[model samples]
Target: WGNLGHETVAYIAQSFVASSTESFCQNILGDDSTSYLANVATWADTYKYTDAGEFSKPYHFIDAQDNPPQSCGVDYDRDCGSAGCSISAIQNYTNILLESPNGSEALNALKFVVHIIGDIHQPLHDENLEAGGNGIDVTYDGETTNLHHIWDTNMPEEAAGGYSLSVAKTYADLLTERIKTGTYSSKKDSWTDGIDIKDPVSTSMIWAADANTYVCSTVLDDGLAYINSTDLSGEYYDKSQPVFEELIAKAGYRLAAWLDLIASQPS
Candidate 1:
């Protein structure tokens, strides 16, 4: 959901959503929803709250989940597991698609499922462990900023000029080539590199650690006060680009795998 407004973020989510739905339809519904790929392509255009069409409502659901009392609550310090909200919005929304009744509701549910999976893969989206990284003050190139915002938008934008979709696609092709070269023992192993656990407790812990580390190091040592224009640099870009690319590729591939599993279920 943190990736909602960013064009690259939206594009990555959109591709995954469309591809997942198509894979599901192909493997289960016998391609019934494959034609909806065009509709899915429009997801990025209709990604925000102000957008028009049936897709608008689901984007609301995606954005709203970033709030408190939600799975991916805004409060990172509070233990979401005890609060009964640790499942993460992506996981909850995906489950909804699996159980939804037929109609527009089901279609939206599937779309949400496709979208949220990509969201969860974003480290920042999963990083609500420190007041959503707001607590982690950092200096980016001598400017003050929180760790969360850096990961959420600044770093990514800096790396690719907010052009993550093209970056993602470029890396996706590279990943595909690497796999073809038998560089990995298995596709599953490659995809599972940073998955941690699907459970909220484990996921939260992973994010918390990541956020805290960034706060302690970059924010504390650098004497940075707040993000400024100078903070955007090729150095930051070099560091962040691979991470973003990896997450995008992993999310897309994992999404395809997950949809394949869902499609295999007797329906």
Candidate 2:
């Protein structure tokens, strides 16, 4: 996901949390949660490449093995190797916040929870042998780039009609207006409420698996193949645009529900 895309998920989650959940977040997050998760939403991406953060490099994505080719999904025990993948990272970090007593750990958990959820929603993040499409080079709207970057940044930019990091309102408005008014208009509550609140860890796993299906559906083809080629813009952009919107919306809505449950639970 793009920085904007991650921020959008945080921004939208902010809108869904109840005021009581806000109070619970305030106690754990202190003053920094003021923007209601916006400020620290991308902390994981910002630090995942650093010396201290290098151990978390694999926590950003997964290489889920598809059984019989058509039966692909995220199984923490099956897909997440010993080094740890995003699915386990998400559940582990969330558990740190909800069940552990460490205050400082809770602070970091809040950030990772905001981030990992959005990261999983991006189809390419739950990839197979293609290294989450990082191994596949493609041209997007005449611009040359890898498939992962296109899905991460290029697709989101078009989905939000040129969303930029400089404007926070762009993301807030996207959650409030563009996204809600789009395809998921009446489905936000239904989609989020559908999460198994008693075991949100599985929710995260299922969510990532949902995104995985889209990888084969949206990210490959002849003209869309791995190439060092030219102005290859076409129907790929138009067809894949709605998937971006839908997934981002789902990310925001579901994150909010999980966060809401976290906050509503007493200390």
Candidate 3:
């Protein structure tokens, strides 16, 4: 997820969070409960490039080495590699937040939880082929770009109408509606079906695998040759737009559920 996608996921989660959970977040973030998560949604992205945050760069993705367009899967032991992946990071930060650290400690952990939940939903973030598609050159609307960048920024922005905070909030509201009684209502419950705070590793691995499935299904459905040969802004974008949109929606609901679990515990 780009800043837009990241913020959008936070916005959607805000809509679903329990009031108890919201208040807990407010105390740690030192801001209005509303938009606190969104405010810090992209902090990890910015922090990852700094010397202090360099170790966290690998925390953003899993780098699954599965063969896409043929098969796709996520094995924590095999994929997480030397640098730990998002699944472990999510588990670590969730524990950190649950431990109830104060000041910047809690804030930093909260930021990682918010950002990484969104990142794991991005299929390529859990993939390794061509550096999660970054190494594969492709064109979007005539401009040259890579597969990972397109999914992270271009497609979501185009599909959501814009890249601003206001736009993210609006898109999130739209998704919230769908999860309520609209298109996604029937399926939203299943989004958090496997979430188990007691077993954070398995819980997040399930989400990662779900997202990874799309790599072979829609992302590389036609394989890499066709992907590099044509402009993806047309048919390719159209086909995967809904997939990414739903992933964003699921990330939000799951984030809320994850926080709610921690909030339920005694602090």
Candidate 4:
């Protein structure tokens, strides 16, 4: 799973949450609370890897096959893997957060909420056919790895490394602000404006769909072929950095909106 992506989303959520949302999250987590809302971001990532959590592995992503020709779309039932899909998982977890009694159960549900949202934002996570690009083997910056890995860990971390989640988030925060008031001012505001909070699952589906479309048009839109060594720098990286920042910014804003809604609801 993409650890930093999850953390970044959580941090963005943290930075923008309403006071009520912040209080609600702290009460929900209790002793588990940390300085940033991302403390539990990777819980499901690790949880889904353990023996007890293996059944949930499919919940982390969807598998919408492109039919080789590559027409990207998400059907909740069709894209969802055998066990379940991330959309359903987000729906279930969001419902759980609303209905679950306060305790470890609710905390876990919240963790899942934090995670699935972040996962859905990742272009590869919504991909299918190529196992979300896991099948597309490529070399990034002299290291041999797959396309999925590059997006998940290499590309983002390349800017700030993996030393500290706090640092990475700080970098993301900086980037977001610069973009918001700078080049991407209109895009950032327009993406975040006028959101409806009535249905999270439905919203998540749209988000996933957007990511899928982006993967088809932007990430792979140019027709990428893993012919030989691939460097994340040079042309590809330069072109991609803005896209990556936009996606992350969208995730943060959407997540904040969701949490603010949850906090305001009757609990």
TM-scores, each model vs. reference: 0.53, 0.86, 0.97, 0.89
- Backbone collisions counted per model: 7, 0, 0, 0
Can you rank all candidates by TM-score, best first?
A: 3, 4, 2, 1
Candidate no. 4 TM-score:
0.89
Candidate 1 positional error at 112, Å: 1.5
C-alpha root-mean-square deviation, each candidate: 7.7, 2.9, 1.2, 2.5
Cα lDDT, model 3, residue 206: 94
Per-residue accuracy of model 1 over 152-213 as CA lDDT, tens digit each: 65665554544344553443445454434544326536553344323433443343333333
lDDT of 3 by residue, 161-216 (tens): 99999999999999999899999999987888878888889999999999999999
Indicate whether candidate 3 or candidate 4 has the larger TM-score: 3
Query: What digit string (tens of lDDT, one per residue) describes model 2 on residues 26-65?
Result: 6666654447577778889977889988888788887777
TM-score of 2: 0.86
Error of 1 at 115 (Å): 1.8
Which number leads on lDDT? 3
Q: Which stretches of candidate 4 lie over 4 Å from their true place?
A: 31-34, 67-70, 101-104, 192-196, 224-229
lDDT score for candidate 2 against the true structure: 0.73
Q: CA shift at 53, candidate 4, in angstroms? A: 1.4
Please identify which of the two predictions, 1 or 2, would achieve the higher lDDT against the true structure: 2
Which model scores highest in TM-score? Answer: 3
